[PDB]
Structures are given as structure tokens and as C-alpha cells.
PDB file of C-alpha atoms (C1' of nucleotides) in Angstrom:
ATOM      1  CA  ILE F  74     139.457 143.249 145.162  1.00  0.00           C
ATOM      2  CA  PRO F  75     139.486 142.283 148.774  1.00  0.00           C
ATOM      3  CA  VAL F  76     140.852 144.334 151.657  1.00  0.00           C
ATOM      4  CA  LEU F  77     141.636 141.380 153.648  1.00  0.00           C
ATOM      5  CA  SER F  78     144.708 139.770 151.725  1.00  0.00           C
ATOM      6  CA  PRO F  79     144.160 140.485 148.091  1.00  0.00           C
ATOM      7  CA  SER F  80     144.265 144.310 147.670  1.00  0.00           C
ATOM      8  CA  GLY F  81     144.312 146.138 144.008  1.00  0.00           C
ATOM      9  CA  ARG F  82     142.318 145.299 140.264  1.00  0.00           C
ATOM     10  CA  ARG F  83     142.329 147.462 137.474  1.00  0.00           C
ATOM     11  CA  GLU F  84     141.103 147.050 133.539  1.00  0.00           C
ATOM     12  CA  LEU F  85     140.152 148.569 130.287  1.00  0.00           C
ATOM     13  CA  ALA F  86     142.660 147.979 127.694  1.00  0.00           C
ATOM     14  CA  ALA F  87     140.031 146.048 126.187  1.00  0.00           C
ATOM     15  CA  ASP F  88     139.612 148.931 123.617  1.00  0.00           C
ATOM     16  CA  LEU F  89     139.830 152.417 125.384  1.00  0.00           C
ATOM     17  CA  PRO F  90     140.741 153.854 121.971  1.00  0.00           C
ATOM     18  CA  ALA F  91     136.746 153.220 120.338  1.00  0.00           C
ATOM     19  CA  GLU F  92     134.172 152.823 122.727  1.00  0.00           C
ATOM     20  CA  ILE F  93     131.122 154.753 120.641  1.00  0.00           C
ATOM     21  CA  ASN F  94     128.906 151.814 119.039  1.00  0.00           C
ATOM     22  CA  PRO F  95     125.953 151.978 121.231  1.00  0.00           C
ATOM     23  CA  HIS F  96     123.264 151.886 118.438  1.00  0.00           C
ATOM     24  CA  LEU F  97     123.669 148.545 116.908  1.00  0.00           C
ATOM     25  CA  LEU F  98     124.729 146.976 120.281  1.00  0.00           C
ATOM     26  CA  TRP F  99     121.318 147.488 122.456  1.00  0.00           C
ATOM     27  CA  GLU F 100     119.491 147.106 119.193  1.00  0.00           C
ATOM     28  CA  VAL F 101     119.992 143.389 117.833  1.00  0.00           C
ATOM     29  CA  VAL F 102     120.475 142.264 121.589  1.00  0.00           C
ATOM     30  CA  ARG F 103     116.694 143.365 122.299  1.00  0.00           C
ATOM     31  CA  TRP F 104     116.002 141.477 119.299  1.00  0.00           C
ATOM     32  CA  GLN F 105     116.380 137.416 120.389  1.00  0.00           C
ATOM     33  CA  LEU F 106     114.748 138.641 123.749  1.00  0.00           C
ATOM     34  CA  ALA F 107     111.807 138.653 122.183  1.00  0.00           C
ATOM     35  CA  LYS F 108     112.506 135.353 120.632  1.00  0.00           C
ATOM     36  CA  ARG F 109     112.803 133.045 123.709  1.00  0.00           C
ATOM     37  CA  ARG F 110     109.744 134.159 124.897  1.00  0.00           C
ATOM     38  CA  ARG F 111     107.066 131.479 123.985  1.00  0.00           C
ATOM     39  CA  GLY F 112     104.183 132.683 121.960  1.00  0.00           C
ATOM     40  CA  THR F 113     101.866 129.644 120.697  1.00  0.00           C
ATOM     41  CA  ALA F 114      98.543 130.500 119.653  1.00  0.00           C
ATOM     42  CA  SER F 115      96.778 129.229 116.479  1.00  0.00           C
ATOM     43  CA  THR F 116      94.939 130.717 113.299  1.00  0.00           C
ATOM     44  CA  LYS F 117      91.541 128.597 111.745  1.00  0.00           C
ATOM     45  CA  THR F 118      89.546 129.009 108.177  1.00  0.00           C
ATOM     46  CA  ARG F 119      91.797 128.078 105.058  1.00  0.00           C
ATOM     47  CA  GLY F 120      89.486 126.219 102.740  1.00  0.00           C
ATOM     48  CA  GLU F 121      87.035 124.505 105.184  1.00  0.00           C
ATOM     49  CA  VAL F 122      87.883 125.074 108.732  1.00  0.00           C
TER      50      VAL F 122
ATOM     51  C1'   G G 163     124.822 126.561 124.517  1.00  0.00           C
ATOM     52  C1'   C G 164     129.460 123.113 123.243  1.00  0.00           C
ATOM     53  C1'   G G 165     128.792 121.137 119.067  1.00  0.00           C
ATOM     54  C1'   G G 166     132.053 122.232 110.938  1.00  0.00           C
ATOM     55  C1'   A G 167     128.843 118.690 107.537  1.00  0.00           C
ATOM     56  C1'   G G 168     125.410 122.444 104.474  1.00  0.00           C
ATOM     57  C1'   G G 169     126.649 129.182 100.817  1.00  0.00           C
ATOM     58  C1'   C G 170     127.922 133.579  98.424  1.00  0.00           C
ATOM     59  C1'   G G 171     132.194 135.057  97.203  1.00  0.00           C
ATOM     60  C1'   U G 172     137.189 135.035  96.879  1.00  0.00           C
ATOM     61  C1'   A G 173     136.641 134.788  87.881  1.00  0.00           C
ATOM     62  C1'   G G 174     135.812 134.040  83.877  1.00  0.00           C
ATOM     63  C1'   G G 175     134.094 132.026  80.317  1.00  0.00           C
ATOM     64  C1'   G G 176     133.844 127.913  76.899  1.00  0.00           C
ATOM     65  C1'   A G 177     128.837 122.113  74.185  1.00  0.00           C
ATOM     66  C1'   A G 178     132.344 119.553  76.550  1.00  0.00           C
ATOM     67  C1'   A G 179     137.047 118.042  76.328  1.00  0.00           C
ATOM     68  C1'   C G 180     139.645 122.001  79.277  1.00  0.00           C
ATOM     69  C1'   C G 181     142.204 126.569  78.267  1.00  0.00           C
ATOM     70  C1'   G G 182     142.364 131.214  81.846  1.00  0.00           C
ATOM     71  C1'   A G 183     142.255 137.147  83.865  1.00  0.00           C
ATOM     72  C1'   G G 184     141.263 135.851  80.496  1.00  0.00           C
ATOM     73  C1'   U G 185     137.044 131.638  76.973  1.00  0.00           C
ATOM     74  C1'   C G 186     134.706 130.305  72.382  1.00  0.00           C
ATOM     75  C1'   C G 187     134.289 130.822  66.318  1.00  0.00           C
ATOM     76  C1'   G G 188     138.213 130.444  63.145  1.00  0.00           C
ATOM     77  C1'   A G 189     144.078 128.028  59.112  1.00  0.00           C
ATOM     78  C1'   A G 190     145.059 132.474  61.343  1.00  0.00           C
ATOM     79  C1'   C G 191     150.376 137.029  64.601  1.00  0.00           C
ATOM     80  C1'   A G 192     145.122 139.254  63.672  1.00  0.00           C
ATOM     81  C1'   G G 193     139.272 140.003  63.167  1.00  0.00           C
ATOM     82  C1'   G G 194     133.963 139.782  66.964  1.00  0.00           C
ATOM     83  C1'   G G 195     130.861 139.643  71.023  1.00  0.00           C
ATOM     84  C1'   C G 196     130.935 137.536  76.577  1.00  0.00           C
ATOM     85  C1'   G G 197     136.570 139.803  80.911  1.00  0.00           C
ATOM     86  C1'   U G 198     139.718 143.678  85.757  1.00  0.00           C
ATOM     87  C1'   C G 199     140.786 147.293  93.310  1.00  0.00           C
ATOM     88  C1'   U G 200     134.742 142.543  90.991  1.00  0.00           C
ATOM     89  C1'   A G 201     134.113 144.012  99.829  1.00  0.00           C
ATOM     90  C1'   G G 202     131.587 141.862 100.218  1.00  0.00           C
ATOM     91  C1'   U G 203     128.879 139.148 104.173  1.00  0.00           C
ATOM     92  C1'   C G 204     124.550 138.302 107.500  1.00  0.00           C
ATOM     93  C1'   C G 205     120.983 140.513 110.949  1.00  0.00           C
ATOM     94  C1'   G G 206     115.978 142.683 112.476  1.00  0.00           C
ATOM     95  C1'   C G 207     113.243 145.965 109.826  1.00  0.00           C
ATOM     96  C1'   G G 208     111.255 146.252 104.681  1.00  0.00           C
ATOM     97  C1'   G G 209     110.518 146.162  99.858  1.00  0.00           C
ATOM     98  C1'   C G 210     109.178 141.956  96.371  1.00  0.00           C
ATOM     99  C1'   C G 211     107.976 137.850  95.070  1.00  0.00           C
ATOM    100  C1'   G G 212     107.250 131.168  95.510  1.00  0.00           C
ATOM    101  C1'   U G 213     103.760 127.320  97.669  1.00  0.00           C
ATOM    102  C1'   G G 214     101.024 128.687  99.809  1.00  0.00           C
ATOM    103  C1'   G G 215      93.630 129.848  98.929  1.00  0.00           C
ATOM    104  C1'   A G 216      98.400 134.168 101.604  1.00  0.00           C
ATOM    105  C1'   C G 217      93.086 139.228 101.018  1.00  0.00           C
ATOM    106  C1'   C G 218      87.550 139.152 102.395  1.00  0.00           C
ATOM    107  C1'   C G 219      82.643 135.024 101.391  1.00  0.00           C
ATOM    108  C1'   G G 220      79.563 134.234  97.434  1.00  0.00           C
ATOM    109  C1'   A G 221      77.855 131.447  91.251  1.00  0.00           C
ATOM    110  C1'   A G 222      74.410 126.697  88.793  1.00  0.00           C
ATOM    111  C1'   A G 223      78.011 122.265  88.599  1.00  0.00           C
ATOM    112  C1'   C G 224      82.452 117.377  89.040  1.00  0.00           C
ATOM    113  C1'   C G 225      83.990 113.066  92.637  1.00  0.00           C
ATOM    114  C1'   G G 226      83.548 109.628  96.364  1.00  0.00           C
ATOM    115  C1'   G G 227      81.306 107.489  99.651  1.00  0.00           C
ATOM    116  C1'   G G 228      75.944 107.930 103.568  1.00  0.00           C
ATOM    117  C1'   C G 229      71.352 108.876 103.364  1.00  0.00           C
ATOM    118  C1'   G G 230      67.854 107.079 100.658  1.00  0.00           C
ATOM    119  C1'   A G 231      60.107 104.905  96.891  1.00  0.00           C
ATOM    120  C1'   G G 232      56.612 105.537 105.840  1.00  0.00           C
ATOM    121  C1'   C G 233      55.036 110.912  98.305  1.00  0.00           C
ATOM    122  C1'   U G 234      55.078 109.886  93.028  1.00  0.00           C
ATOM    123  C1'   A G 235      56.423 104.347  90.096  1.00  0.00           C
ATOM    124  C1'   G G 236      56.495  99.712  87.737  1.00  0.00           C
ATOM    125  C1'   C G 237      55.194  94.651  88.572  1.00  0.00           C
ATOM    126  C1'   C G 238      55.208  92.246  92.440  1.00  0.00           C
ATOM    127  C1'   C G 239      51.304  89.430  97.522  1.00  0.00           C
ATOM    128  C1'   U G 240      46.375  89.805  99.306  1.00  0.00           C
ATOM    129  C1'   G G 241      42.750  91.647 101.352  1.00  0.00           C
ATOM    130  C1'   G G 242      38.552  95.485  99.590  1.00  0.00           C
ATOM    131  C1'   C G 243      35.223  98.293  97.410  1.00  0.00           C
TER     132        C G 243
END
RNA sequence: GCGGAGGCGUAGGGAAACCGAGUCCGAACAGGGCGUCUAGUCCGCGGCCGUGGACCCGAAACCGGGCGAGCUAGCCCUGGC
């Protein structure tokens, strides 16, 4: 990518033919993100408490 | 994150031995009910359940241990009236 010595770089072959699955992509990704975040609080009563 | 041991299918059916897209009864080529493009598979979300008390508190009691007669008891010691 440089312009000093090296100069030139192209890609997309990966899979240009399709590329149209945005639905599920963003979705689930969003999911685990929520996980990591620590959420520690308690619940109380049951029988005695 | 790197990190394969753990599942459901990829068959069934049969007490089992074990046969097989077919199995089991029966002496039976036969009768008869259970077999085959059965895409499934794991996510979040959700039904909908299992333990969970899992909706909400609550009824007199049963179990354990602590408190317990500075009231009422009975006698027990001795002062009194």
C-alpha cells in the first residue's frame, strides 16, 4: 500500500458473487457483545430471607 | 482465546442372542403389526414444561434446640401473723 517503495494492493475475490446476508450478520454479533459486560446483582426472599 | 473427551442424526427394528432397510411371532416361500430422498443442525427470542417455593403474603400446628415457676404449684428451709 505504500507509495515509497511498494505501490499496489487489490482484493474482493473472497466472494463477490453473493454478499447479501446483513440480517443475521449484525444480529447475533450484537448478542455476545451484551454477554461480556458484567451484570452482578442479587435476588432475595424465597422461603425465609 | 489456542485448547476434541462429551450430542442428535447419518436405521431400523428385536426380550436377548443379533439379524438388517429391513426386525419380531411362526415349521413356513407365505400371513400381521412396527420399515424408506428420514437435512437435518445449533443460535438469540419464545412457547412449554423439571427442580426449583418459581407467581404474591397469610390458617390452628409437627421437629430442634434456647429461654423459661422475680405469677399460679406441690412439698421442701424458717422467720411471722
